[PDB]
Write a protein that binds this ligand. Structure first.
Ligand SMILES: COC(=O)c1c(O)cc(O)c(Cl)c1CCc1nccn1Cc1ccc(Cl)o1
Length: 217
């Protein structure tokens, strides 16, 4: 249940890190944008079958900081991923045109190259020592994908179905990336990266203080 990344994905990872170490916050743009895509897919699926929305009726992105645990969570109620999809889409295969989307990277700002080829997930390793993807798809049981980028593993989630339908990306942050645990930093970055997203985006925030979802767009 442990897997080597494919070679071009290794190169893509290294390329994305060396390109973007200057602009780490880009990871958040990409995760938000990828969450939006997932929501789009399940909304499209719901056109012809709205049993599609049964496990979870809402279409949202919900972002949560755990400063004490050094975690950042990005959760969408999109289409989710099957176990098989986690293995194929997140490492073992590359999309057509990968086998050098990589020239264009080097040659001829890679900020939009990544967003354009839909490969921004890997910018998560800019700010994170570990990335965990917990995902629930209508056609499968909830699974966990985990990676420090030197391999990955996929397991059935022992907790069962807690997402309903969708995906959480959990980042174990690097020391270099500790500012991304701060609420005002994340809020200000989610506001900026979500103004053109059509799904509502929440940050778990504080306001006798109480916590709750704060809408960011
Ligand atoms: C179906 O996508 C997702 O459930 C999802 C999500 O909800 C939030 C996210 O931040 C990300 Cl990264 C994802 C997955 C992104 C993705 N889905 C299929 C492929 N990929 C990324 C990818 C890059 C190269 C190849 Cl092959 O696949």
């Amino acid at each position: 249940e442990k897997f080597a990344f494919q070679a071009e994905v290794n190169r893509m990872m290294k390329l994305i890190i060396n390109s973007l170490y200057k602009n780490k916050e880009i990871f958040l743009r990409e995760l938000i944008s990828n969450a939006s895509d997932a929501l789009d897919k399940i909304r499209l699926i719901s056109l012809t079958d709205e049993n599609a929305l049964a496990g979870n009726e809402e279409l949202t992105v919900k972002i949560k900081c755990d400063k004490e645990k050094n975690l950042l969570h990005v959760t969408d109620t999109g289409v989710g991923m099957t176990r098989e999809e986690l293995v194929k889409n997140l490492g073992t295969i590359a999309k057509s045109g990968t086998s050098e989307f990589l020239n264009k990277m080097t040659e001829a700002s890679t900020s939009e190259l990544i967003g354009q080829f839909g490969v921004g997930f890997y910018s998560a390793f800019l700010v994170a020592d570990k990335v965990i993807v917990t995902s629930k798809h209508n056609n499968d049981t909830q699974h966990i994908w985990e990676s420090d980028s030197n391999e990955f593993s996929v397991i059935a989630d022992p907790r069962g179905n807690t997402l309903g339908r969708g995906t959480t990306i959990t980042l174990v942050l690097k020391e270099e990336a500790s500012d991304y645990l701060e609420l005002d930093t994340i809020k200000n970055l989610v506001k900026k990266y979500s103004q053109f997203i059509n799904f509502p985006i929440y940050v778990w925030s504080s306001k006798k203080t109480v916590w709750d979802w704060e809408l960011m767009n």
